[PDB]
Write a protein that binds this ligand. Structure first.
Ligand SMILES: [Cl-]
Ligand SMILES: [Cl-]
Lengths: 207, 209
């Protein structure tokens, strides 16, 4: 197909962090995350938002209105992560994403292909998280799918440090003279004190 | 009535920033801002979010489950600002606060008293702040006749004051980023000093203040 696919090992324990960490590392414009229940999608978006990820759920107990808003902040980039379910995830109103994550594995080819088909705006990415005792299941899914999936380890604690670190860098770079000029004088105060610790700490708040 | 009452001038449609600015300067443990309708409490809440205020809307459409959460966050400190209508602000689940702010003059004078009774926490004292436009310099006089009391007339806060406040607030969260957490970035900081990159630091403070 026109997209890439990887299979990432993660104990259901640290399956959330892995998700987050993978997100920091690639940090794509739009990520679509599928899970098995409405509780999960909600449960999940909650853990993400906590870790510094603009994630919001997408399910059935959603009034078409809150669901246009959700898909609105997602299309505008306000929301970067969409934790969804196969059904809420259906329509014409469903925008395309850059990365697809099967937080829990799909039992059918049509399933995998309905979720995975939501990636590509030019080719895209697809990631599969699996617990240790989920091996065969992935082996079965592969057979249903017809293609095999590369086994890629999870992102390194340092891999993530440097990813966050480089996005923080790109952010400051985006700030404009009109907004940062308001603060130059305070910047001077810090230079004048020249205590490397204060600034490191300010950076620690952001990163 | 022991607490303090004040009338503070707001520009036409700049009541938000004056509110925020008043928040930053006063930094009260809990604040309650009264509005006329829920779309109001809705808008001022989101507004206060932008400007760096942990605030939440409290209107009557809220389920009793949301109601409880919201008010739990507020009593516990997770929410510093509660934005309510008069109807929604009814109940013994509402806690006493440090600051009551009437976003607009109370529709009526009995309303004032009822809003204002919310302020005042033992060992902390309490304060009322009335926000008035320019057409309303008359209305306040009236409210003071109807209530038979004078509100101190208090200048809003000067941009300096505001900035110094955000700043002290910020250095405050910093006083607890253990060395453990920030060490990795000191060299980079050092280079920013050496290469005199004040703008980067400036962009940094923008993203934080
Ligand atoms: Cl389906
Ligand atoms: Cl106005």
């Amino acid at each position: 197909v026109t997209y890439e696919e990887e299979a990432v090992p993660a104990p259901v324990r640290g399956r959330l962090e892995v998700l987050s960490d993978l997100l920091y590392v690639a940090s794509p414009d739009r990520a679509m995350v599928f899970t098995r229940t409405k509780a999960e999608t909600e449960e999940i978006a909650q853990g993400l938002l906590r870790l510094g990820h603009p994630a919001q759920a997408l399910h059935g107990d959603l009034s078409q209105g809150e669901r246009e808003r959700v898909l609105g902040a997602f299309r505008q980039g306000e929301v970067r992560v969409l934790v969804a379910t196969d059904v809420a995830a259906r329509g014409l109103d469903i925008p395309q994403v850059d990365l697809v994550v099967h937080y829990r594995l799909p039992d059918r080819a049509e399933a995998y292909q309905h979720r995975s088909g939501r990636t590509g705006r030019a080719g895209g990415r697809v990631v599969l998280l699996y617990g240790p005792r989920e091996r065969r299941d992935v082996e079965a899914l592969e057979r249903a799918v017809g293609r095999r999936f590369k086994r890629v380890n999870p992102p390194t604690p340092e891999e993530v440090l440097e990813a966050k670190w480089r996005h923080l860098l790109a952010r400051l770079a985006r700030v404009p003279e009109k907004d940062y000029r308001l603060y130059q004088d305070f910047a001077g105060r810090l230079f004048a004190e020249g205590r490397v610790e204060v600034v490191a700490a300010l950076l620690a708040l952001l990163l």
